[PDB]
């Protein structure tokens, strides 16, 4: 019987159960701008992102201001002390507090270099939503972000109606347009920090009746093991459950597969070092996540599909070739003799 629940593969992946139990630097300075008109500045930030302004570098700073207004209510000392910053500080990030008074344009916050940013902001016209709504809407992208653009936006269109037919939150219809969704997709795809700050919040937040934080909570929970689902269902099928406990499938213990099983455990160990941040590894592009692709292990994919075929169930995203088809046929028969 295979580990169809998914508990063991989750515990192994997170790092709660060791890999050996079954199988046997430079910092980046980010400016934290201190202002009085935090609500006003954040409105000028949202408008710029709506317009499609690519701040590139200064993207982290202006996004960090939106998170301060909503999640930290304008408290700099509480933000610099929070667990989110504590993790970032030990993972190649440094937060420098810079005081700024009398700021009326985003050009006053921009660092000296990036000539197109001040030009695009100058051409912007002078004429609806809050910082929190922006953050919660961007969190709706996380579920299917790594999948593809069409798959991501479709999931975004579907979720919006779910949140509206339950009265949790209603977003401006100017956001529901293809163009603005694509602008936010491109931002979420390239900007690491926004993904992590939404993820850290979804992971560590006892919400609550705040509509935006509840949307972040659900979206972060939906994004768990995103882009690692195929390899998680494969690991679930290559795990044999006996009367004593859980053990590796006999077909993986053979001399022919031995080299691949060694590569798999080396990639599973790298993933498990991330602790609680392991389900979001592909989403966050963490160290050694690319070595954990389902395609890189076609012998383990053959044993996984074989065991599944015996039970009548299929594996979505698993395409076993002719070369490994022999191993698929042997795995089906071994599971049939129960």
UniProtKB/Swiss-Prot annotation:
<feature type="region of interest" description="NP core">
    <location>
        <begin position="25"/>
        <end position="338"/>
    </location>
</feature>
<comment type="subunit">
    <text>Homooligomer. Homomultimerizes to form the nucleocapsid. Binds to viral genomic RNA. Interacts with VP35 and VP30 to form the nucleocapsid. Interacts with host PPP2R5C; this interaction leads to VP30 dephosphorylation and viral transcription. Interacts with VP24; this interaction facilitates nucleocapsid assembly and genome packaging. Interacts with matrix protein VP40; this interaction allows recruitment of the nucleocapsid into progeny virions. Interacts with host STAU1.</text>
</comment>
<comment type="similarity">
    <text>Belongs to the filoviruses nucleoprotein family.</text>
</comment>
<comment type="function">
    <text>Oligomerizes into helical capsid to encapsidate the viral genome, protecting it from nucleases and the cellular innate immune response. VP35 binds to and stabilizes monomeric NP, keeping it soluble. Upon virus replication, NP is recruited to bind cooperatively viral genomic RNA and VP35 is released. The encapsidated genomic RNA is termed the nucleocapsid and serves as template for transcription and replication. The nucleocapsid is helical with a pitch of 10.81 NP per turn and a diameter of about 22nm.</text>
</comment>
<protein>
    <recommendedName>
        <fullName>Nucleoprotein</fullName>
    </recommendedName>
</protein>
